[PDB]
Design a protein around this nucleic acid. Sequence first.
RNA 1: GGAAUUGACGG
Length: 533
Amino acid sequence: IDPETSKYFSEIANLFDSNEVELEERSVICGNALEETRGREYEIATDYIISHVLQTLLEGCELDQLCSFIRNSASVFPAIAMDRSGSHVAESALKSLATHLENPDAYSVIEEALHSICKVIVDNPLDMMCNCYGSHVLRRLLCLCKGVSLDSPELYGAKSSKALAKRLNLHQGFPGMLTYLLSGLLSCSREDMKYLQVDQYSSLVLQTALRLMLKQDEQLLEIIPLILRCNGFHIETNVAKEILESMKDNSFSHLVEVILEVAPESLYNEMFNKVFKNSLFELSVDRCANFVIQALISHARDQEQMGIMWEELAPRFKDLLEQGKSGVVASLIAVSQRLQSHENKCCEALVGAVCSTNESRISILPRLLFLDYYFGCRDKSTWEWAPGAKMHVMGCLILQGIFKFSSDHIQPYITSLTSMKAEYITETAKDSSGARVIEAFLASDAATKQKRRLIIKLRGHFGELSLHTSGSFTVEKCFDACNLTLREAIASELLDVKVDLSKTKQGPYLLRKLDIDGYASRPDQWKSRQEAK
RNA sequence: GGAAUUGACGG
């Protein structure tokens, strides 16, 4: 790259920093600057400095000039896409195309641009899929072909609180282009495919494509056998063995997670019987495979599978908790309630797992609230609490699922929570995971007198709870579950902290929802409007 | 206006 080229693209850069150029002129200058890339797309897109300017250009130009860049650069796009700087240039071009998805006049121009990209990729895909930079480009490209434009963690595919809450049960796009690109990424030998399964970056690409094909059963039934190398759907014994042995690999385990999530019923049933049945517990103790088990459990379809999973895993609930595999337990509990099978057996197995003697069953709640401290401590027969400590996220999610059961199945849990001394209860409410347990109990079908007993034990702390951003929710839910007598006590306690409360983010909504000002000025009128509630 | 598993990701 000669100095006139660098000086030119730098000077274009400085010209945009000096915001003396309206958007109208700006998008013209962007398109004109793209012409200075013709014949040297690779050199400029991979330049560690000028790549950043070229990103600015692709995101600020108009659809016609963007499409010309994608067409002119297409024979070198795979090289650009696999470069540490060029990959962000390639991704800028896709993000820019994606801004036009909502425009129906743009459909055929975009499709043509994707076609020239997909054609060069499909011609030689395997190194691009496995390249650390190129894998990100493919992920975005697959998303664009599907018509999604907004990056989502799950699609790329990170963990997210929304997916956990789903796992724990708490635009048309360019379809022919998606199918054509994906078929190109899959038309390799069974022996190549065996190693795509275990390469981090290719696994990530296939995870995205699988997720994008959710509920496209005719396609999923074509692509999943290719990924699993078992080309009616049937897994032969030798292939099932190879799948089972690769299940502890970190890359393949993530891929099988997604496969279980999108698998149509007949495909799921075959994987259940031919791969996982009889190995559930061994896979549940592996640091990678247990998450595959977590996904298997979540998408179980019928009570017969629920029986098989309960036999292999419930006797080992204590082992799973000790070895840091509470997610497996959480999933089994959660799906029993979804399938309406083995509900009582699951709750009773969890109690027995945490409380071996009969004496210790009154402590089921504190021990699940601090799952890791209790199973970690030197002497478990004296562990009572973990003062000051952050409570255990998955133990609290377990409890949140527990309280969605009918009260018939969870009497040990209700008794244990409603028995905790006042200081422990308010400690739970001040904890951002523990408050979700309390709110789950308040929403459960446990008796009102039992709810009222726990709420009464929070008296004297509603002011401080209201100051917590998480605890303030608990205050409303306590309030809504109360008689007039306790609605007034709570309202009175938010009164003493009204100045501080109104500062905080939630305060204004809390004060309004509870009508705290009306209580302070017209207490009789406040009381009579609540007794009507 | 709220915590988000124990195992991956970029000039």
